Symmetry: D2
Subunit: 116 residues, 4 copies
């Protein structure tokens, strides 16, 4: 698993379950092409988005659909989504964990990058 | 000032000065129209982006060039930029402050939405 | 104002108003001596805690009563309080702003340390 | 494992390894008694601090020695330590993950609380 995303709920102190997200890759013509998508599990984690062979050098965007998450809980949040944009595998393959901690009017995001 | 942006540096414990950003408004064809831009001041703040009459309801994106900020400090960053995508809502008067707290491999963002 | 505290509410997207806090200074016997206190204003800020001459180098603790804040909004919180423990340092002049961003099960805190 | 602590480094995008921390419990006379201590592993995690039988109702304090962590990396940080104070097991046994995301002048902390 070279790319894993973990989402936490700072209001309930729980994983953020069933959070949808889309991953895009910047194409040579500078547009965003669809790369992978999925939803977080009961642990707040989304695994298996890609493989080492498919996950080439590039600029990637993770768009986490935080608005739908909060709406289903009865909250009208500030953000449309949490957006994480980063260059990946510039110095060879790495393993990436992207984390997001969600509140209705705020979110934090961090990356843990490890060398296989 | 209906919309202000404040950027802070979590490594130096200081305003993040001379940080460039662009604000976009989502168009009917789901593309991002440039709307305003600028660079943070010595206080880390960017004022005067828009006016009350110009700032209508809609989806806005603030794209903060964090990568250039960290590269100018000689620190390798994770993100290409920090993105803040939100719906501006006109139920009551609203002044928006978008704040971002920057670290090389993480950022936090919050909205302080008040009434004069 | 050598020391100011600002508290924000990540659930409502607003200053955290009427938040009580106490500031302590570590004594020679490793106990916490009360030093100053107050409640945040309508802007979420607490000014006038100390003066330049009183605020000497040492270890300070800011104890923010986040639990009472959330209980007054009817929201069950995780933390008993938010603690910010830091060394005040006199190499150059220094103005300190302690900020805290509150969620029921999470908080962030940062220091913005500037020079007039 | 009813109590686990995870520490991340927001400057390097890595687990925070070999971070010491002490856990205290509030005694009936309102003083802090030592409860458990340890250091984070190569994954940034500290497991096995306590057991379900030992981890009774009470007010607990986790003091994470962030200052020693940053000093060893050549950074002079703002905080003496990160302090997490919370009531545990008030409604029966729970499993607690305490997380801390560290920067030199800022930290975030969150709790994930699950029912066994
Ligand atoms: O967003 C924040 C913020 C973000 C965090 O992750 C943690 C925290 F303690 C504050 C913020 C907002 C403001 O309006 C503001 O003035 C400041 N400040 O000056 O320090 C900060
Ligand atoms: O990024 C974080 C994170 C973000 C924050 O704003 C504050 C904080 F204390 C941790 C994180 C990453 C992980 O991999 C992870 O397991 C967890 N967790 O379990 O709680 C959290």
């Amino acid at each position: 698993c070279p790319l894993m995303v973990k989402v936490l709920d700072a209001v309930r102190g729980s994983p953020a379950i069933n959070v949808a997200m889309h991953v895009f890759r910047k194409a040579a013509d500078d547009t965003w092409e669809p790369f992978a998508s999925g939803k977080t599990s009961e642990s707040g984690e989304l695994h298996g988005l890609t493989t080492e062979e498919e996950f080439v050098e590039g600029i990637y965007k993770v768009e986490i659909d935080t608005k739908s998450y909060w709406k289903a809980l009865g909250i009208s949040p500030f953000h449309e989504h949490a957006e994480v944009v980063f260059t990946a595998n510039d110095s060879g393959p790495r393993r990436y964990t992207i984390a997001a901690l969600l509140s209705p009017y705020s979110y934090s995001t961090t990356a843990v990058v490890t060398n296989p």
